[PDB]
Amino acid sequence: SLALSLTADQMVSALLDAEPPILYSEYDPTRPFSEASMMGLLTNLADRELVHMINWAKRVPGFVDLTLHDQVHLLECAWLEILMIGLVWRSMEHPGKLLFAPNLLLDRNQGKCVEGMVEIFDMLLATSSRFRMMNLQGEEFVCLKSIILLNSGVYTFLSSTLKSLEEKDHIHRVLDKITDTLIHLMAKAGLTLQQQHQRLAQLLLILSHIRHMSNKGMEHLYSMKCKNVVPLYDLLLEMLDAHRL
Amino acid sequence: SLALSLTADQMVSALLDAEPPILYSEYDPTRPFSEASMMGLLTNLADRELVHMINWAKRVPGFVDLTLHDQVHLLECAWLEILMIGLVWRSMEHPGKLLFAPNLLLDRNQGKCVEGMVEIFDMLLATSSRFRMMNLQGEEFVCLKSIILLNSGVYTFEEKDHIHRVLDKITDTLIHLMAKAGLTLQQQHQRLAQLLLILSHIRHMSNKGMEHLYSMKCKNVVPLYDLLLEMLDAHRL
Amino acid sequence: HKILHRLLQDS
Amino acid sequence: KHKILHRLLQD
Numbered sequence: 160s161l162a163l164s165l166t167a168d169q170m171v172s173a174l175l176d177a178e179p180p181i182l183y184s185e186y187d188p189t190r191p192f193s194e195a196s197m198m199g200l201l202t203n204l205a206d207r208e209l210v211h212m213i214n215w216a217k218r219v220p221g222f223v224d225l226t227l228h229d230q231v232h233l234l235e236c237a238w239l240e241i242l243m244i245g246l247v248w249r250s251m252e253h254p255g256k257l258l259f260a261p262n263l264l265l266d267r268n269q270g271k272c273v274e275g276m277v278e279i280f281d282m283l284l285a286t287s288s289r290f291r292m293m294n295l296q297g298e299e300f301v302c303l304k305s306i307i308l309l310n311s312g313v314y315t316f317l318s319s320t321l322k323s324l325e326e327k328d329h330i331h332r333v334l335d336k337i338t339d340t341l342i343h344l345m346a347k348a349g350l351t352l353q354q355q356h357q358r359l360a361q362l363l364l365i366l367s368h369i370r371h372m373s374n375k376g377m378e379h380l381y382s383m384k385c386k387n388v389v390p391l392y393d394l395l396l397e398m399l400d401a402h403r404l
Numbered sequence: 405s406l407a408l409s410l411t412a413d414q415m416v417s418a419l420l421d422a423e424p425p426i427l428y429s430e431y432d433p434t435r436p437f438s439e440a441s442m443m444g445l446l447t448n449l450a451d452r453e454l455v456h457m458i459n460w461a462k463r464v465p466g467f468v469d470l471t472l473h474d475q476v477h478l479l480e481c482a483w484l485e486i487l488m489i490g491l492v493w494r495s496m497e498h499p500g501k502l503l504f505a506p507n508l509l510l511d512r513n514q515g516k517c518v519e520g521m522v523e524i525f526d527m528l529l530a531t532s533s534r535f536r537m538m539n540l541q542g543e544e545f546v547c548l549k550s551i552i553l554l555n556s557g558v559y560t561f562e563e564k565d566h567i568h569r570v571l572d573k574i575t576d577t578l579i580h581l582m583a584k585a586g587l588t589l590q591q592q593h594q595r596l597a598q599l600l601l602i603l604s605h606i607r608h609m610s611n612k613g614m615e616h617l618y619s620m621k622c623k624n625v626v627p628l629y630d631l632l633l634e635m636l637d638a639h640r641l
Numbered sequence: 642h643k644i645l646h647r648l649l650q651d652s
Numbered sequence: 653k654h655k656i657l658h659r660l661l662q663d
């Protein structure tokens with residue numbers, strides 16, 4: 160079940176088919192929200208999404224080839240990035256609001272309910288605005304999401320002879336394949352060569368902002384943790400701790 | 405804009421000519437360093453480098469076309485990323501070491517001298533290794549550094565349209581350099597992607613470093629210079 | 642890295 | 653407000 164053999168169309172197909180479902184938040188929640196209130200809803204949804212994310216990762220071409228320790232590291236480093244790009248993606252057709260869930264559509268004003276959270280909401284909205292301006296496509300989105308998984312912690316990985324060096328070139332080869340896929344999709348859309356490279360760069364630069372939001376969000380979450388405002392969701396907490404060691 | 409009509413070669417020439425100088429750290433053969441001495445040398449160097457970074461920014465095609473406010477925003481957002489990619493760049497010739505300055509070449513062991521610093525050093529060392537492994541060229545480096553300046557704060561900001569256009573021009577310049585070097589069309593987009601993905605890692609190192617600097621500021625092991633503090637506060641209080 | 646480990650292990 | 657950055661950028 161090699162991934163280096165997959166064709167561009169096959170790659171997209173696999174990714175699209177591996178897509179996780181869109182989860183619902185607690186129904187008919189009490190409004191207006193309180194800090195501990197919004198925090199609970201958001202982290203509860205995240206904790207449940209993480210379970211699906213882990214199982215989605217196993218479906219990302221080449222991911223299963225890596226060692227468990229390597230799979231663990233990649234996900235621990237990229238989980239919030241992956242949650243955020245999915246969020247931004249769902250909010251695309253909803254200017255001004257973040258679609259955390261079909262029954263949880265929030266705007267920047269609701270972000271003020273949690274201290275320091277409005278800053279994060281604004282960055283998320285700006286990114287969604289950016290996706291809209293570019294008219295980001297689903298095929299491109301699933302490609303970008305897989306890139307985040309494979310790339311975010313690819314260097315944070317320790318070197319150890321051809322050993323670790325093996326679980327590195329393989330990742331880079333796959334990453335290269337996703338690049339070919341992206342270019343393939345753009346070419347099929349009739350984009351000129353110059354337009355293809357320009358769009359490819361535009362899409363990848365987005366990942367820089369996504370990493371930035373994850374860093375800020377992580378710091379913020381760890382902040383809410385100490386303030387004892389985050390419910391006890393083990394998986395979520397575990398992953399958050401990974402960003403402390 | 406005037407940078408929008410520049411050719412790829414014209415773009416590369418402008419960038420290479422705007423390169424800031426390589427500064428020196430305070431001379432002193434006293435080794436090893438203490439937490440305070442290391443912190444003092446690193447922050448003193450950065451503060452001096454920031455002055456030259458501001459002049460360099462002014463020479464990046466398209467930057468002065470922005471209002472002062474926009475210029476301020478971009479620099480406040482990307483300053484550590486820019487110092488870091490520069491550090492990583494000059495460290496390429498010194499595998500396993502970080503060349504902060506010609507008279508200040510440090511290894512990961514010396515990073516341990518400051519609590520929490522070794523983790524940042526490791527990320528920096530890994531990035532330098534990646535650049536070396538990729539055989540990153542100076543012309544590619546100047547393009548990447550300018551991309552950071554124009555991209556990092558581009559969303560958290562009419563002006564975005566101008567920046568996006570200049571950003572596209574640099575992409576055109578990168579592909580041009582690769583084509584000229586003999587890479588196939590496929591090797592070109594593959595390399596462009598590899599290069600741009602590293603900017604995600606540079607952003608990560610900057611946020612970790614910003615957190616660390618602010619933490620070191622609170623521990624107050626040494627006073628920070630005014631310009632550096634200004635740049636740091638832009639991210640914190 | 643316990644729960645993630647196990648959840649990733651789950652066959 | 654007054655920023656050293658403003659002065660250097662305006663030189």
Ligand SMILES: CC/C(=C(/CC)c1ccc(O)cc1)c1ccc(O)cc1
Binds near residue numbers: 204242243259380383
């Ligand atoms: C931005 C809110 C958030 C998170 C991730 C848990 C969050 C929550 C509380 C904080 O203090 C910081 C971030 C999140 C939740 C679900 C998603 O699909 C995407 C992002």
Ligand SMILES: CC/C(=C(/CC)c1ccc(O)cc1)c1ccc(O)cc1
Binds near residue numbers: 449453488614
């Ligand atoms: C990583 C060290 C560092 C900085 C920036 C001042 C630093 C110093 C102390 C800290 O606690 C954190 C970061 C730096 C200094 C000069 C450069 O050209 C590049 C990076």
Ligand SMILES: [Cl-]
Binds near residue numbers: 182207
């Ligand atoms: Cl559910």
